[PDB]
Amino acid sequence: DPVIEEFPLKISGEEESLHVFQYANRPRLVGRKPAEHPFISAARYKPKSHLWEIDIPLDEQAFYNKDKAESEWNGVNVQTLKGVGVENNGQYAAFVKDMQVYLVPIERVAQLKPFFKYIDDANVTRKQEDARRNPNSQNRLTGSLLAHKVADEEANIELTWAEGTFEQFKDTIVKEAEDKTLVALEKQEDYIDNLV
Amino acid sequence: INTAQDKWHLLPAFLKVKGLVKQHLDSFNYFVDTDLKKIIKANQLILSDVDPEFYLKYVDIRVGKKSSSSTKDYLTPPHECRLRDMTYSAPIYVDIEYTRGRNIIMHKDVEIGRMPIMLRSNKCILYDADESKMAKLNECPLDPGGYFIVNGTEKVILVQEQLSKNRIIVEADEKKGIVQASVTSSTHERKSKTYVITKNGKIYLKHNSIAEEIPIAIVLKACGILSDLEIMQLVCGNDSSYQDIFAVNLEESSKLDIYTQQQALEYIGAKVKTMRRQKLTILQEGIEAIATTVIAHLTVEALDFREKALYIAMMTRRVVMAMYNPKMIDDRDYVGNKRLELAGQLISLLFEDLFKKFNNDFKLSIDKVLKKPNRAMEYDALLSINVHSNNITSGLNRAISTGNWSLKRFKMERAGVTHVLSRLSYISALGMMTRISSQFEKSRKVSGPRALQPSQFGMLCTADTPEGEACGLVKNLALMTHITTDDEEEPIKKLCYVLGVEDITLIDSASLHLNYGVYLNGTLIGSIRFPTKFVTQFRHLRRTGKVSEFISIYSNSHQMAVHIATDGGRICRPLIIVSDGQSRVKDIHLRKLLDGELDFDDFLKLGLVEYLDVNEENDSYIALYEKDIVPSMTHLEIEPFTILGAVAGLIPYPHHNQSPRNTYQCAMGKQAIGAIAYNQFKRIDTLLYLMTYPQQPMVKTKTIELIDYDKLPAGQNATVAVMSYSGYDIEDALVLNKSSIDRGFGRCETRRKTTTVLKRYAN
Amino acid sequence: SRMTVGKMIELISGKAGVLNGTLEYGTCFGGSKLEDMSKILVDQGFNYSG
Amino acid sequence: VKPIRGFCQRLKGKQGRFRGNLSGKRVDFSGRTVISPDPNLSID
Amino acid sequence: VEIAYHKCDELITLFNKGELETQPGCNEEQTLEAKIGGLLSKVREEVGDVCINELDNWNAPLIMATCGSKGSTLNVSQMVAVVGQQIISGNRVPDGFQDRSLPHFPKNSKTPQSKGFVRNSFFSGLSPPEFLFHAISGREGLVDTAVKTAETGYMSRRLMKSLEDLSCQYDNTVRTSANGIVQFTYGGDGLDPLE
Amino acid sequence: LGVPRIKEIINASKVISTPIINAVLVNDNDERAARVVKGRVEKTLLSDVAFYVQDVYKDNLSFIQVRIDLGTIDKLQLELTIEDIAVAITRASKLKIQASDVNIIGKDRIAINVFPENDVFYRMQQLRRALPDVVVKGLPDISRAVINIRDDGKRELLVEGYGLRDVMCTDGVIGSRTTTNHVLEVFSVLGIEAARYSIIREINYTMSNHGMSVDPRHIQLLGDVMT
Amino acid sequence: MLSFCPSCNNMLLITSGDSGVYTLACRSCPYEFPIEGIEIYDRKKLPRKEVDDVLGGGWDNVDQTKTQCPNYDTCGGESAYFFQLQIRSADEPMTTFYKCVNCGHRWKEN
Amino acid sequence: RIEQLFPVRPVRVRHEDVETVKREIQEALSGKEAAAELELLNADHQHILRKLKKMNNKPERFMVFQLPTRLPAFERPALSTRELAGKVGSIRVHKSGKLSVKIGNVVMDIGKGAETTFLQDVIALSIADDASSAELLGRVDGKIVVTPQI
RNA sequence: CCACAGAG
Ligand SMILES: CCC[C@@H](C)[C@H]1CC[C@H]2[C@@H]3[C@H](O)C[C@@H]4C[C@H](O)CC[C@]4(C)[C@H]3C[C@H](O)[C@]12C
Ligand SMILES: [Zn+2]
Ligand SMILES: [Zn+2]
């Protein structure tokens, strides 16, 4: 019944706008050991459509045989993962500093899935080849059509990748945290009757 | 002094406020209160095409209430309408805002037609009327109401029964060897059926719009699931036999060289036959087809195609489970898979079609006038609205009277919706209401819809059905039931996410079948770690009163899922909660109820009684008496003889009779000659049978007492001597007494009506 | 052949009720039992089985 | 739209000429009445 | 009926453990169902026999069964003694819920009082589950009576249209309308079944 | 038996439901003989005789290995050998395998090789999924066979299929007293007179099952009409 | 064969190309796995059911004959348990079943 | 890298014992139903306590809280303080090996919820026209869930 | 001309 030790929550980072990707093609663990995070080459974020693209330079010394890739895929050497950032309220990424648990909101969650740009490139080149050889108001699009059109006709923003930022981020979070301690307003019973 | 065995006193109180014919009344009241506002709010705005400055907008609508006067307008009494061969109705008042030249004229109380009121509604003149004022209006106080007086006749919209909308139904054909899963997605725009069938051992998806049967891997790839390992993990999970069945469908996508989302989308869009309206590219047509056409009720807005993909994946998982063994197919005839459409919904749909036609014709006439330059004050609406207003009431009256039901916008064709209320007896008039008509009548499949499934214990009558060709297709509601009402689902979604449901857009696809999944109205909504505690917490919040009591929660262990049902049309039954082997309704509550206070809704508010539908009953364990209570019990029946309907209540000692005799009496008690109503002499009906000296039954029934058959009986008590008096009683014949007939036994009279109209010819 | 024992029970219940002067209830899954009807009929001077 | 009645429609079906007016037809000098027993009447 | 219930419960326990013996060759569920049905039919027959033996003379159903005018031994046994197992489409009552008959019985159960057996007489009144099961049986009887007529009448019409032209000519040969012989003698001996 | 049975007989339908073929045995007073004569007519698939089926890729070859145990053959007393299974595999039409690819490795293993894009994988996957459903011993139309005992103690065999001639031509089954309830098979095997006898017997059995007591002369007349 | 890709998680199609060697090629991404040296295989374990015995205990307290056993690489036994059973039609010779005393391996003659 | 490019064979479990190995698959990566729920609750509470003790002052280590979307309101130092800052609650642990989370004055139950089978990471994003940078803050190692107690 | 509703 009684408590031996309390692990205090501490909410901060209301403007940092953190994001989390969820790779849909690599296991969290290989064997009982943890897996190895892939090296990161480049990324893109669409502002309007909230699309994420991540490029991973895949291994070339084994199980590649670049002859096929240069034969019909123009020598592709990086695998791309595309994901949609979807809103999920009630999500907090947390860490532990000196037995004190710190939390920060996650704005969106992305499901990165493998994408094949070069297949679409070959398809559109073939379509041009077999279409140009022989011929053979105005606003009605809604629903997901407008979102796809926005994702197409937007302008991609090239991002920069940095590592080791965790120390500065943790320092900023704890500095934004330590200054404030809050006092309760309503009783427990007042929580039940309205969206428990 | 009181005991628990007299808990049956909850039954009269339940009938004191709710009413026995509440199924029509509550639906019509809800229609008048809210669906008029919804119908106006859908398409209130009307614009011209020739002069783009004239806008006409309806603001508010009501029936029988003038805005200027607090008192409601005068309506003809129902019996006056019955005699004079009119339609009992109230005008439809609507607020209007339009432009007179440049002036923004707000005008009020313009009549757009007469809406035929249903008797004893909240808009009728017989609402909460004492028997003195009811006698003033030549109306019987012991009349169920709930019927529409049109053109002199009185018609009843019978409660329709359909297969549950927006639900996955899996059926197997063993002689042909095809398993399929069907979803009838019905919404305001379309009502389309999607099939997922198995052909030649491969899972195909077919739709009426699509020309060819799309392979399932193609549509799963097109719906956002690019990788095939994710597809296999979603459909099969960590299982051997399911993967062995399903690997062919993974191979099928590789055979057709489809590997990206664009490829599958254009492959699907090449097959879509409904191209019109200056079509876009094939890829965008396929996007539209996947977004709306394949499953209409789940619409996708953003780029994220997760929920539609998981819906199709769960449907195919059901299909694969059907392939593994054909015993795990849900029964189509199960009561929990059937929903009851009431009069209010059908009237709302018909009014929607009529109002759309009215607005279209009004816009056409306004454009016809305003196209010409000679316009004076923009040709005010109230001058040219009445000739279009008459069409609304003409359509409503014709649709109610003729019984034909033709709505072109929803492509729906119905016949035999309304029936003439049979006034052969008071019990016959009552039993015409609470009658459920099945969806199809052509099929003669024995042991199908006609057989009495055990799932209708206490929800439908177990003995009342007409004998003959319609035996089993026309059913009757039980004495103590309640048909649910439609509720919003987004607050339930938020409550689910609060209570511990992890969303689908943040959980693993591979581990999804390693724990229970939550379904809202048949659509997968997330995953739950502990399903039992979640179910218990949801039940406790329902019983407290923090969410609507008609929301149902039940855990299906075979599918390893937990379902929440919200939509209306589910048939329910109230029951007493028993906890820890003790019934939650003690003797003090019964004494409080009998003393006058603490009505049935107070029993609902304190968590003493609650409503269960069939699916909820599947998860319960109900005891029948106090002696049968064990610590594993979940609910307690209030009283068992509610399983017989209103008509079946006339039979004394029905449990001592063979069931076909009970059914025959249920059929033939509606032809009894007796008193019809308190005002049976002021009525002029086409054929009416009356008895000179009706008598009370010597052996009554509690059902007889509740439905007030005691006040208006049909039949006499006869001193019978069971013996073979002569040869004239052989083969069911009876031997009457001459002196008894002379003194008045069985004396009857018949009243017929001849009508004539002096037509005023055009000459 | 039609096996309607409820008819005999109804007859005896009605006879005992009219002799006692009170209407008797034949509610499904319950109602006034046969033994009380037999007792009332015996106390009124008729046969126990009607 | 109501389908019209053709000659093939007039000759086919349970209400056609062959099964409705030729194989069997309504006859004169007939009566339909409810029955009741009479043991004192001879069997013929 | 208590002995029959106890033996049935023993067989259910043996089936639940798994060591139930499949003598007829079908699977475990089918042989358990067959054994339970046989046991319940036996107990109905035994109680009906002792009931018929225990009825004195001048008992009206017994007299009307001895005469053969109306009723039979089974009807008297059902009214006075245990009614017996209700059978729907050749089997017991189907599981209308999730692997159980009615919500008034515990899940995953095959006891006779839950699968459709009634232990109450028609004189003694029926419990609500027994009432529902008997209602199901009466309903299937009524619907079979209602729907057999169309197929039977169609078959009768087809037979009569096929056989309307045959007649026995004066040379004792059955011939068609077109004067072709079907049988040389009717039945091989030329005897009317009427006489 | 009932209204559907009469409807299915008098309306002579080529395909029926429950087509029981009843066969008497030359040695009807021995359980082992009944079992071994059941083993000839009751079809046994490759899935009942194979431990597994697997697909092996060599360095430049691709084949399918099947492991047949002689233990199940000896325990069931099926008159089946490994080369019999091989030639039975050759008699499959949908697989389209020519009769020179199946080879014998060891005394159990049977190898099915496929020779030539991506067509080889598709072909051998189809063969792997369809191979354990091939018939290796029995009759194609016989669904199942049950050994029954008559009241005098003699044993008979009831099969559910349409292969009347194959059942009555197999050794161990008396070919003079074997009958079936289906009437078109009786016609096509034994002539119009035997078809007439089958019609009369089936209608009489169905009528006497309900105890309706219809005189057999009407049944004989109906049989003479249909034949 | 149910191998799944480690790059894009797709189905591996085995192709020969043109040189004649089978490879676990993937058409969705550049990846394959040659099968040189060790070989790959996918075994589907068919179910093993308990079928009905036919000669279960058919040689108890029976006479023993003197017949040479076909298997002479395991046992040198010359006494065999035999049983006469009518298996064919009545016009054909009566078959018999007999087995070695040491190594089993039952065999029949007609 | 050799196992990363090794072709993956998917998880296969026989149909009869899929439910029996459910606990094993759950444990490998990281009345009757009521007793099972209690057993999972106790094991989960011990696992969460051990996990919290493990990552004390460890870089690139994260756990995701699933908290109610409508937190209890508070007083600004009434606008109800929709956006929160500072210390709000505490993860208290009891003598009986059970855990609870007190947010303000509301006690709530804790658990781990669904367990993931793929790599997760937490990333901070800064968007501006002149400069833009996306930073990998660390790896997300498991997720936990906190539900209101009634 | 249809469709309901009952009676065998
Ligand atoms: C998959 C279902 C197969 C089934 C419909 C096929 C396969 C075997 C077929 C029968 C055999 O051919 C022998 C007969 C030939 C006669 O001419 C007509 C009848 C006859 C009994 C056949 C009917 C039918 O044609 C059968 C049963
Ligand atoms: Zn790949
Ligand atoms: Zn040997």
Indicate yes or no: strand I within 7 A of the C-beta of B403.
yes
Tokens of G78: 């010359």
Half-sphere exposure of E15 (CA within 13 A, CB side): 21
Query: Are F36 and F58 contained in the same domain?
Result: no
Cα(A62)–Cα(B733) distance, integer angstroms: 99
- Whose structure tokens read 């505690």? B533
Please state the atom number of ligand 1 nearest to the C-alpha of residue F188: 16
Is D40 close to B733, i.e. CB distance below 8 A?
no
Residue B696 CB-density burial (10 A; 0-12 exposed, 13-18 middle, 19+ buried): middle
Pair G85, F34: CB distance under 8 Å: no
Pair B124, B29: CB distance under 8 Å: no
- Best of A80, A91, A196 to substitute, by most chain B Cβ atoms within 10 angstroms, is A196
Strand stretches in B164-265, DSSP E: 168-173, 178-186, 191-199, 202-207, 214-215
What amino acid is encoded at E110 in this protein?
K
Tell me how far the alpha carbon of residue B301 lies from the centroid of ligand 2, in angstroms.
30
Cα(F163)–Cα(F189) distance, integer angstroms: 10
Q: Chains B, E: CB contacts under 8 A, how many?
A: 103
CA-derived radius of gyration, chain E:
25
Tokens of E143: 């619907």
Query: Are F123 and F164 contained in the same domain?
Result: no
Pairing of strands A100-115, A18-23: parallel
Residues 6 or more apart from E121 whose CB is under 8 A from it?
A: E78, E79, E80, E81, E82, E83
Indicate yes or no: strand I within 7 A of the C-beta of B423.
no
Pair F166, F180: CB distance under 8 Å: no
Residues 6 or more apart from G44 whose CB is under 8 A from it?
A: B244, F52, F53, F54, F128, F132
Pair F26, F175: CB distance under 8 Å: no
Pair B322, B172: CB distance under 8 Å: yes
Method used to determine the 3D structure:
cryo-EM
Indicate yes or no: strand I within 7 A of the C-beta of B668.
yes
Q: Is the dihedral of CA E126, E127, E130, E135 positive or negative?
A: positive
F141 lines ligand 1 (CB under 6 A): yes
What number of other Cβ atoms are within 10 A of residue B58's Cβ?
A: 21
Residues 6 or more apart from A91 whose CB is under 8 A from it?
A: A105, A106, A109, B506, H64, H65, H66, H67
Pair B24, B477: CB distance under 8 Å: no
Residue E103 CB-density burial (10 A; 0-12 exposed, 13-18 middle, 19+ buried): buried
Phi/psi of residue F224, nearest 5 degrees: -70, -25
Residues 6 or more apart from A147 whose CB is under 8 A from it?
A: A49, B301, B302, B303
Query: What domain range includes position F128?
Result: 43-138
Cα(H24)–Cα(G94) distance, integer angstroms: 59
SS3 assignment, position E32: helix
What number of other Cβ atoms are within 10 A of residue G39's Cβ?
A: 11
Cα(B577)–Cα(B635) distance, integer angstroms: 5
DSSP state of G64: E
Cα(B85)–Cα(B151) distance, integer angstroms: 5
Tokens of G86: 């009518």
Mutate which of F15, F168, F181 for ligand 1? The one with the most ligand atoms within 8 Å of its CB, which is F15
Query: Are F38 and F143 contained in the same domain?
Result: yes
Sequence length of chain B is: 763
- Whose structure tokens read 């016959």? B428
Tell me how far the alpha carbon of residue G29 lies from the centroid of ligand 2, in angstroms.
4
Tokens of E25: 């060759």
Pair C34, C9: CB distance under 8 Å: yes
Query: Are F51 and F133 contained in the same domain?
Result: yes
The resolution in angstroms reads 3.4
Mutate which of F16, F18, F162 for ligand 1? The one with the most ligand atoms within 8 Å of its CB, which is F162
Pick the closest to residue B565 from B550, B575, B546, B545 (CA basis).
B550
Tokens of B626: 């106090």
Tokens of A154: 């937007």
What number of other Cβ atoms are within 10 A of residue B626's Cβ?
A: 13
Phi/psi of residue F125, nearest 5 degrees: -65, -40
Residues 6 or more apart from B92 whose CB is under 8 A from it?
A: B36, B61, B62, B63, B111, B112, B113, B114, B115, B392
Cα(C37)–Cα(C43) distance, integer angstroms: 10
For the CA of E159 and the C1' of I7, the distance in angstroms is 29
Q: After which residue numbers is chain B interrupted with C–N beyond 2.5 angstroms?
A: none
| Exposure letters B562-572 (e unless 16+ CB within 10 A, then b) | bbbbbbbbbbb
DSSP state of A181: B
Phi/psi of residue G50, nearest 5 degrees: -90, 100
Pick the closest to residue B511 from B221, B237, B239 (CA basis).
B237
Q: Which residue is nearest to nucleotide I2 (CA to C1')?
A: D2
- Whose structure tokens read 């009426």? B208
Is B497 close to H18, i.e. CB distance below 8 A?
no
Phi/psi of residue E175, nearest 5 degrees: -130, 155
Tokens of B575: 């029951």
Residues 6 or more apart from B652 whose CB is under 8 A from it?
A: B697, B699, B700, B701, C6, C9, C10, C13, C26, C31
DSSP state of B656: G
What amino acid is encoded at F205 in this protein?
Y
The residue nearest atom 10 of ligand 1, judged by CA position, is F162
Tokens of B744: 């008045």
Cα(F53)–Cα(F68) distance, integer angstroms: 9
| Exposure letters B419-448 (e unless 16+ CB within 10 A, then b) | eebebbbbbbbbbbbbbbbbeeeeeeebee
- Whose structure tokens read 């490829």? B263
F212 lines ligand 1 (CB under 6 A): no
SS3 assignment, position B103: strand
Where is B579: in which H helix or E strand?
strand B571-579
What number of other Cβ atoms are within 10 A of residue E150's Cβ?
A: 11
Pair C31, C6: CB distance under 8 Å: no
Report B:710-749 residues touching D (Cβ under 8 A): 726-731, 733
Tokens of F28: 């009807």
Residues 6 or more apart from A28 whose CB is under 8 A from it?
A: A34, A35, H29, H116, H117, H118, H119, H120
Chains H and C touch (3+ CB pairs under 8 A): no
G9 known member of a binding site: no
Distance from CA of B251 to the nearest CA of G (A): 8
Q: Could you tell me which residues are beta bridge partners of residue B348? A: none
Where is G82: in which H helix or E strand?
strand G79-84
Pair C3, B648: CB distance under 8 Å: no
CA-derived radius of gyration, chain A:
24
Query: Are F93 and F119 contained in the same domain?
Result: yes
Phi/psi of residue A172, nearest 5 degrees: -65, -40
Nearest nucleotide by C1' from B668 CA? I6
Strand stretches in chain A, DSSP E: 3-8, 18-23, 29-30, 33-34, 42-45, 51-57, 78-87, 91-97, 100-115, 157-158, 161-162
Among the candidates F123, F138, F153, a domain finishes at F138
F160 lines ligand 1 (CB under 6 A): no
Query: Are F48 and F133 contained in the same domain?
Result: yes
- Axis-axis angle for helices E128-162, B659-668 (nearest 10): 80
Residue F43, phi-psi category: left (phi > 0), alpha (psi -120 to 50), beta (remainder): beta
What number of other Cβ atoms are within 10 A of residue B345's Cβ?
A: 20
Query: What domain range includes position G26?
Result: 1-47
- Whose structure tokens read 């006779």? E112
Residue C43 CB-density burial (10 A; 0-12 exposed, 13-18 middle, 19+ buried): exposed
Q: How far is CA F161 from CA A36, B174, C19, in A?
A: 62, 17, 71
Cα(F195)–Cα(F188) distance, integer angstroms: 8
Catalytic amino acids of G? 91-92
Q: How is E78-116 classified by DSSP, letter by letter?
A: HHHS--EE--BTTBS----BTTBS-TTS-SS---HHHHT
Tokens of B748: 């009857």
Query: Are F62 and F21 contained in the same domain?
Result: no
Tokens of C49: 């089985």
Q: Could you tell me which residues are beta bridge partners of residue H139? A: H61, H121
Cα(E73)–Cα(E48) distance, integer angstroms: 8
Among the candidates F121, F138, F155, a domain finishes at F138
Q: What torsion do the CA atoms of B290, B292, B298, B300 make, to the nearest 10 degrees?
A: 70
Where is B252: in which H helix or E strand?
helix B240-255
Tell me how far the alpha carbon of residue G5 lies from the centroid of ligand 2, in angstroms.
5
Pair G69, G103: CB distance under 8 Å: yes
SS3 assignment, position B148: strand
Domain ranges of chain H: 32-150
Q: How many domains, chain F?
A: 2
Residues 6 or more apart from A56 whose CB is under 8 A from it?
A: A38, A39, A40, A41, A78, A79, A80, A81
Q: How is chain H classified by DSSP, letter by letter?
A: -TTTSSPBPPP---STTTTTTHHHHHHHH--HHHHHHHHHHHHHHHHHHHHHHHTTT-TTEEEEEE--SSPPPB-----TTSS--BB-EEEEEETTS-EEEEETTEEEEEE--SPP-S-EEEEEEE--SS--EEEEEEEEEEEEEEEE--
- Best of B327, B332, B438, B452 to substitute, by most chain E Cβ atoms within 10 angstroms, is B452
Cα(B596)–Cα(B588) distance, integer angstroms: 13
| Exposure letters F156-178 (e unless 16+ CB within 10 A, then b) | bbebebbbbebbbebebbeeeeb
Q: After which residue numbers is chain F interrupted with C–N beyond 2.5 angstroms?
A: 116
- Whose structure tokens read 């008192």? B71
Q: After which residue numbers is chain H interrupted with C–N beyond 2.5 angstroms?
A: 30, 77
G26 known member of a binding site: yes
Residues 6 or more apart from G82 whose CB is under 8 A from it?
A: G59, G62, G63, G64, G65, G67, G96, G97, G98
SS3 assignment, position E168: strand
- Find the angle CA(E178)-CA(E180)-CA(E181) to the nearest 5 degrees: 145
Q: Could you tell me which residues are beta bridge partners of residue B736? A: none
Cα(C40)–Cα(C24) distance, integer angstroms: 12
Pair B311, B522: CB distance under 8 Å: no
Q: Roughly how many angstroms between the first and final C-alpha of chain G, as a whole number? A: 46
Q: How far is CA B318 from CA B198, B327, F113, in A?
A: 12, 12, 37
| Exposure letters B483-498 (e unless 16+ CB within 10 A, then b) | bbbeeebeebbbbbbb
Pick the closest to residue H117 from G3, B235, B510 (CA basis).
B510
Pair G107, G98: CB distance under 8 Å: yes
Q: How is chain F classified by DSSP, letter by letter?
A: --HHHHHHHHTT-SS-S--EEEEEBSS-S-HHHHHHHHHHHS-EEGGGTEEEEEEEE-SS-EEEEEEE-HHHHHHHT----HHHHHHHHHT-STT---TTSEEEETTTEEEEE-----HHHHHHHHHHHHGGG-EEES-TT---EEEEE-TTS-EEEEEESS-HHHHHHSTTB-SSS-EES-HHHHHHHHHHHHHHHHHHHHHHHHHHHTT----HHHHHHHHHHH-
Q: After which residue numbers is chain G interrupted with C–N beyond 2.5 angstroms?
A: none
- Find the angle CA(E26)-CA(F41)-CA(F87) to the nearest 5 degrees: 120
Q: After which residue numbers is chain A interrupted with C–N beyond 2.5 angstroms?
A: 136
- Sheet containing strand B435-437, edge to edge, reads B338-341, B159-163, B435-437, B474-476
Pick the closest to residue B258 from F122, F121, G11 (CA basis).
G11
Cα(B613)–Cα(B273) distance, integer angstroms: 41
Pick the closest to residue H135 from B657, E134, A172, B130 (CA basis).
A172
Query: Are F196 and F217 contained in the same domain?
Result: yes
Pairing of strands H61-66, H89-94: unpaired
